[PDB]
Amino acid sequence: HMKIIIAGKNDIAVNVTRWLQKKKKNIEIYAICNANDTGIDTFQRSFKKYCKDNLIPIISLAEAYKIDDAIFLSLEFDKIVQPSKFNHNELFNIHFSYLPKYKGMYTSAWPILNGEDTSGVTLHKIDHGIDTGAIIAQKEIIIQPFETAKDLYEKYISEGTSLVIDNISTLLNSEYVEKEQNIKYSSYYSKKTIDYSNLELNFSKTAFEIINQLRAFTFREYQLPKLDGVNIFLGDVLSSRSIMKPGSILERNDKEIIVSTIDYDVVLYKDNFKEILEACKYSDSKYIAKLIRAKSILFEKNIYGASPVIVAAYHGNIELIKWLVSKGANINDRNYKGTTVAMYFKDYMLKSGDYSGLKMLIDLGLDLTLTDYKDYTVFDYLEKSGNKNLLQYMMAFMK
Amino acid sequence: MKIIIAGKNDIAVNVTRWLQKKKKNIEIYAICNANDTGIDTFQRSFKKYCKDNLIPIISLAEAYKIDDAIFLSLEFDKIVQPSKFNHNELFNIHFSYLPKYKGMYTSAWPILNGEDTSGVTLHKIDHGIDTGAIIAQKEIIIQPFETAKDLYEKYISEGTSLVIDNISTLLNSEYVEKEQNIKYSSYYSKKTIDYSNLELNFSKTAFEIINQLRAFTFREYQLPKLDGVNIFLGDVLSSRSIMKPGSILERNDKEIIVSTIDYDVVLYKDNFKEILEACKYSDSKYIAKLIRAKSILFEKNIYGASPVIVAAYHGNIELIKWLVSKGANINDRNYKGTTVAMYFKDYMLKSGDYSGLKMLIDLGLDLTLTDYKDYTVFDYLEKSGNKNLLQYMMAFMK
Numbered sequence: 076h077m078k079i080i081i082a083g084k085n086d087i088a089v090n091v092t093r094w095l096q097k098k099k100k101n102i103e104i105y106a107i108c109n110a111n112d113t114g115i116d117t118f119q120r121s122f123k124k125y126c127k128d129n130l131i132p133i134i135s136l137a138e139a140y141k142i143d144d145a146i147f148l149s150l151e152f153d154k155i156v157q158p159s160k161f162n163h164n165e166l167f168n169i170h171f172s173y174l175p176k177y178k179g180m181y182t183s184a185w186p187i188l189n190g191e192d193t194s195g196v197t198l199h200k201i202d203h204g205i206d207t208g209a210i211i212a213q214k215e216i217i218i219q220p221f222e223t224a225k226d227l228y229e230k231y232i233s234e235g236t237s238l239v240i241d242n243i244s245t246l247l248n249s250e251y252v253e254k255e256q257n258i259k260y261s262s263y264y265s266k267k268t269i270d271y272s273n274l275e276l277n278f279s280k281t282a283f284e285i286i287n288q289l290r291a292f293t294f295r296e297y298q299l300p301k302l303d304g305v306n307i308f309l310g311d312v313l314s315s316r317s318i319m320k321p322g323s324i325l326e327r328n329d330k331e332i333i334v335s336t337i338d339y340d341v342v343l344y345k346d347n348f349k350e351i352l353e354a355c356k357y358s359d360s361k362y363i364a365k366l367i368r369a370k371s372i373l374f375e376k377n378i379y380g381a382s383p384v385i386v387a388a389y390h391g392n393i394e395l396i397k398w399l400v401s402k403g404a405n406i407n408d409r410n411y412k413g414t415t416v417a418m419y420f421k422d423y424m425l426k427s428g429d430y431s432g433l434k435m436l437i438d439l440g441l442d443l444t445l446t447d448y449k450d451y452t453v454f455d456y457l458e459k460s461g462n463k464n465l466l467q468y469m470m471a472f473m474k
Numbered sequence: 475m476k477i478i479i480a481g482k483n484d485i486a487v488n489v490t491r492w493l494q495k496k497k498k499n500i501e502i503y504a505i506c507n508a509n510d511t512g513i514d515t516f517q518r519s520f521k522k523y524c525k526d527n528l529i530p531i532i533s534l535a536e537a538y539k540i541d542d543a544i545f546l547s548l549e550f551d552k553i554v555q556p557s558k559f560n561h562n563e564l565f566n567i568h569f570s571y572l573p574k575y576k577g578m579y580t581s582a583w584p585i586l587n588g589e590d591t592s593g594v595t596l597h598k599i600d601h602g603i604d605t606g607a608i609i610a611q612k613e614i615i616i617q618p619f620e621t622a623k624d625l626y627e628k629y630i631s632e633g634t635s636l637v638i639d640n641i642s643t644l645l646n647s648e649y650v651e652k653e654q655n656i657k658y659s660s661y662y663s664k665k666t667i668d669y670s671n672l673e674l675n676f677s678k679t680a681f682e683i684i685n686q687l688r689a690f691t692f693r694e695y696q697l698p699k700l701d702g703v704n705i706f707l708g709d710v711l712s713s714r715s716i717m718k719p720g721s722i723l724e725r726n727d728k729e730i731i732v733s734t735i736d737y738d739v740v741l742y743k744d745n746f747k748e749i750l751e752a753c754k755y756s757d758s759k760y761i762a763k764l765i766r767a768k769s770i771l772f773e774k775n776i777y778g779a780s781p782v783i784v785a786a787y788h789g790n791i792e793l794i795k796w797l798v799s800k801g802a803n804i805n806d807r808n809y810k811g812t813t814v815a816m817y818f819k820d821y822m823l824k825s826g827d828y829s830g831l832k833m834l835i836d837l838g839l840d841l842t843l844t845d846y847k848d849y850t851v852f853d854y855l856e857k858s859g860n861k862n863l864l865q866y867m868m869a870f871m872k
C-alpha cells in the first residue's frame with residue numbers, strides 16, 4: 076500500500092524508478108517531469124519517455140501536493156517545491172554536492188573551477204530553501220584531475236542512484252535519521268553565476284585555474300570552450316612562461332593553440348573528435364594515436380552516443396577496438412538508445428561474414444547478455460532477422 | 475653592502491627605517507610607485523619618507539645597472555626583467571600564502587572565499603607574476619571576527635617581520651629556495667572587484683554574506699552599504715525566512731535583518747562616529763551598550779584617532795582600562811605617529827592632574843616611543859618649556 080512520487084529527470088530518475096519496479100513492484104509510482112524533458116532519449120534518458128513506455132502516470136506538482144499517503148523524492152527536479160502545500164513532511168532530495176558546500180546550480184562546473192579534489196552526493200530533507208534541509212546520507216566523490224564536467228556529472232548520476240537505492244527502504248518505512256546542516260562553509264551558486272550564452276575563457280588566471288576552466292566547461296552536448304570561436308578539447312600546462320600579456324596567442328598549429336597566462340603557458344588542444352570518429356572506421360591505432368592530443372577524447376561521443384569504440388566495432392576494426400580498450404574504452408560501450416558494442420559488431424559480422432574476432436572481444440569482456448532500452452539482446456535482433464546461424468555462433472562464444 | 479627598496483606604504487617605510495637604525499652602514503636607493511602622492515594618508519608615503527631622509531630615488535632602468543645591490547620589492551607595481559640584472563638577488567614580499575592568492579586584493583579574496591588562514595611570502599622575482607621560488611613564508615590565522623582591514627594589518631606587520639627575520643640571508647646569499655607548486659594556485663586581477671560599485675550579494679548563504687561584510691569592511695576605503703546605510707559587521711541568526719534572499723525582514727536604528735538562502739542575517743548599522751564622540755566623557759557601562767561588534771572599538775577616524783586616543787586626550791582613564799581589557803592598544807597612534815602618551819600628556823597639561831600616568835604605565839604605556847617627526851613626548855615638553863611635567867614623567871624612566 077505504499078506510494079512514491081518520483082520528480083525529475085535523466086538516468087537517475089530512470090534508474091531509481093526502474094529499481095522500484097523490479098524490487099518494489101508492490102509500490103505505486105507517480106512521476107513528475109521537468110519542463111525541458113522532450114520525451115526523446117538524449118545523452119541522458121528521457122524520464123517522460125520511460126514513464127509513458129511503462130504506463131507510469133505523469134502528474135503535476137499541484138496534484139502531488141494532495142497525495143497524503145506518498146513519499147516525495149526529487150532527482151534533478153527543476154521546480155521549487157513549497158513544503159507547506161504538502162500535508163506531510165516525507166520530502167527528500169538528492170543534491171549533487173557534499174552539502175553544505177555547493178548548494179544551487181552547476182555543481183558539475185563550480186567544484187572543478189574552484190580547484191576541488193572532491194565533491195559528493197547528498198540525500199536530504201526538502202525545506203523552503205534551496206538545498207538547505209537536514210542531511211540523511213552522503214557520499215564523497217573523487218574528482219580525477221583529467222575529468223571534465225561531463226565525467227563529474229555522470230559520476231553524480233551514478234553515485235546518486237546508489238545512494239538512493241542504499242537508503243530508499245529507510246525513507247519508505249520512516250526509519251531514517253536527519254541532522255541540520257551547518258552554517259560554516261555553506262556555499263551557494265545561482266544560475267546567474269555562469270552565463271552559458273556568453274562563456275569565456277579567462278586568461279588572467281593561473282595555468283592551474285585555466286585548465287580547470289577547460290575541464291569545467293567541457294560538456295560536449297552543451298558546449299566546448301572556444302578560443303576565437305575554435306572549439307577546444309582540454310589542454311596542458313607548459314614549462315615556459317611568456318613575457319606577453321595574459322590572453323596573448325603564442326602559437327597556432329593544426330592541433331593546438333598556446334596561450335600566455337599569469338604564470339605558465341598553456342596549450343589548448345583543438346577539438347578534432349569528429350575527425351577522429353570518421354577515422355575509427357578503417358584507420359589503425361598508429362594513425363589514431365597521432366590524431367590524439369588528450370587521451371580522454373577517445374571516450375567522447377557524438378549526439379547519438381557513438382564512440383570511437385562503437386564506430387570501430389561497427390566496421391570490424393578489431394585492432395583499433397583492442398587498442399581503444401587498452402587505453403580505457405568500455406568494451407560494452409552504448410549509444411544513447413542503449414545499443415551495445417556487441418550489437419554493432421554483429422552488424423559487421425553479418426555484412427562481412429568474418430566472425431573470427433568475436434572470441435577475442437569476449438576475452439576483453441564483451442557481454443552478449445546486455446539489453447538496449449527496448450529490452451532486446453543482440454540475440455533477439457538476430458532471431459527477428461532470421462539469422463539463426465549467426466545466433467548460434469554468438470551463443471556458443473558467450474560467457 | 476647595498477639595497478634597492480622598490481615599493482610603497484608602511485612596509486617599505488618600516489623596513490627602510492629598520493635598516494637605517496640597525497644597519498646604518500648599508501646604502502639605500504629607493505624606487506617609488508608612480509601613484510605615490512608624496513603625502514601620508516592612513517598609509518605612510520614611502521616617497522615622502524625617502525625625500526625627508528635624503529634617500530635617493532631611482533628608476534627601474536638605473537636599478538638594472540647597480541651590480542652590487544640586492545633588489546627588494548615591497549609591493550612594487552612594475553614588471554621587472556629578471557635576467558637583465560647582473561645578479562639574481564631579486565626579492566618580493568607578497569601578501570598571501572603562495573601559491574594561493576597571487577595578484578590583487580589579498581586582504582579581501584581569502585575572506586570572501588571562506589578561508590581560515592592566509593599569510594605572507596618572501597620569494598624570488600621571476601617570470602610570471604607572483605610565481606618566483608619561495609624563500610620564507612609565515613602563516614596567518616584569520617579569526618572569524620576579523621575584517622579586511624584586520625588582515626591587511628597582519629600582512630604589514632608580518633611581512634615587515636618576515637623581511638627583518640631574513641635580511642641577513644638576503645644580503646649574504648644564504649637563503650634556501652623552493653620552487654612553487656602549480657596545484658591550488660589562484661590569481662585575482664584588479665577587475666575581479668569593482669570598489670567604485672560595491673554591492674552586497676544576498677543570493678548567497680549566511681556564511682558567504684557575513685564573509686562579504688568582513689571582506690568589504692575597510693573603513694578608510696569603504697564600508698558595505700544596505701539602502702545606502704553603512705554597516706559595521708553583522709551576525710547569523712537561527713531563524714530561516716521564507717522570503718526571497720535580500721528581503722528586509724526588520725529595520726530599527728541599530729540593525730537590519732535580511733533573508734538569505736539559508737539563515738537570516740542581522741547587519742549592524744555603523745555607529746563608530748557616535749561611539750568616538752561619547753568616548754570623550756562616557757564611562758564603560760554606557761559605551762558597552764553602544765557596541766554591536768567588539769572590534770568597532772579599534773576603528774579610527776580620518777585623522778587616525780581611535781577610542782583609546784580620544785579617551786586619553788580627555789583623561790578618561792576609567793574607559794581606557796576597559797578599552798585595553800577589550801583588546802585595545804594602549805600605545806595606539808594617529809596618522810602622524812602621535813601616541814596615546816602624547817595625547818595624555820596634553821590632558822595632564824590642561825588638567826594639572828598628573829596622577830593617572832602610573833595607571834596607564836601599568837596598562838603598558840610606553841613613553842620612549844617616537845612620532846613621525848621623530849620626537850618623543852619628552853622632546854615636546856622640552857620645546858614647550860613645561861619643565862615640571864617633564865620632571866614628573868622622567869621620574870618613571872628606568
Ligand SMILES: Nc1nc(=O)c2c([nH]1)NC[C@@H](CNc1ccc(C(=O)N[C@@H](CCC(=O)O)C(=O)O)cc1)N2C=O
Nearest residue numbers: 279321547550551552553554566600602603604663664
Ligand atoms: N618579472 C616580474 N615578476 C614579478 O612577479 C614581479 C616583478 N617582476 N616585479 C614586482 C612585482 C610585480 N607584480 C605585478 C603583478 C601584477 C601586475 C599587473 O599589471 N596586473 C594586472 C593586469 C594583468 C592581467 O590580469 O593579465 C592586474 O590584473 O591587476 C603587475 C605587476 N613582482 C613580484 O613578484
Ligand SMILES: Cc1cn([C@H]2C[C@H](O)[C@@H](COP(=O)(O)OP(=O)(O)O)O2)c(=O)[nH]c1=O
Nearest residue numbers: 151180181182183184224228271294297298
Ligand atoms: C545548462 C548547462 C549546463 N551545463 C553543465 C553544468 C551542470 O552542472 C550540468 C548539468 O546541468 P543541467 O543539465 O542543467 O542539470 P542540473 O540543472 O540538474 O545541474 O551541465 C553546461 O555545461 N552548459 C550548460 O549550458
Ligand SMILES: Cc1cn([C@H]2C[C@H](O)[C@@H](COP(=O)(O)OP(=O)(O)O)O2)c(=O)[nH]c1=O
Nearest residue numbers: 578579580581582622626669690692695696
Ligand atoms: C583599492 C581598495 C582596496 N581595498 C582593500 C583590498 C586590498 O587587499 C587592501 C589593500 O589594498 P592596497 O595595498 O591599498 O592596494 P592598492 O594597490 O589597490 O592600493 O585594501 C578596499 O577595501 N577598497 C578599495 O577601494
Ligand SMILES: [Cl-]
Nearest residue numbers: 456457460462
Ligand atoms: Cl540482426
Ligand code: NA
Nearest residue numbers: 159160161162
Ligand atoms: Na500543509
Ligand code: NA
Nearest residue numbers: 266269270271
Ligand atoms: Na546561466
Ligand code: NA
Nearest residue numbers: 316317335336
Ligand atoms: Na605569461
Ligand code: NA
Nearest residue numbers: 530531532533
Ligand atoms: Na632619480
Ligand code: NA
Nearest residue numbers: 664667668669
Ligand atoms: Na577594481
Ligand code: NA
Nearest residue numbers: 715733734735
Ligand atoms: Na531565507
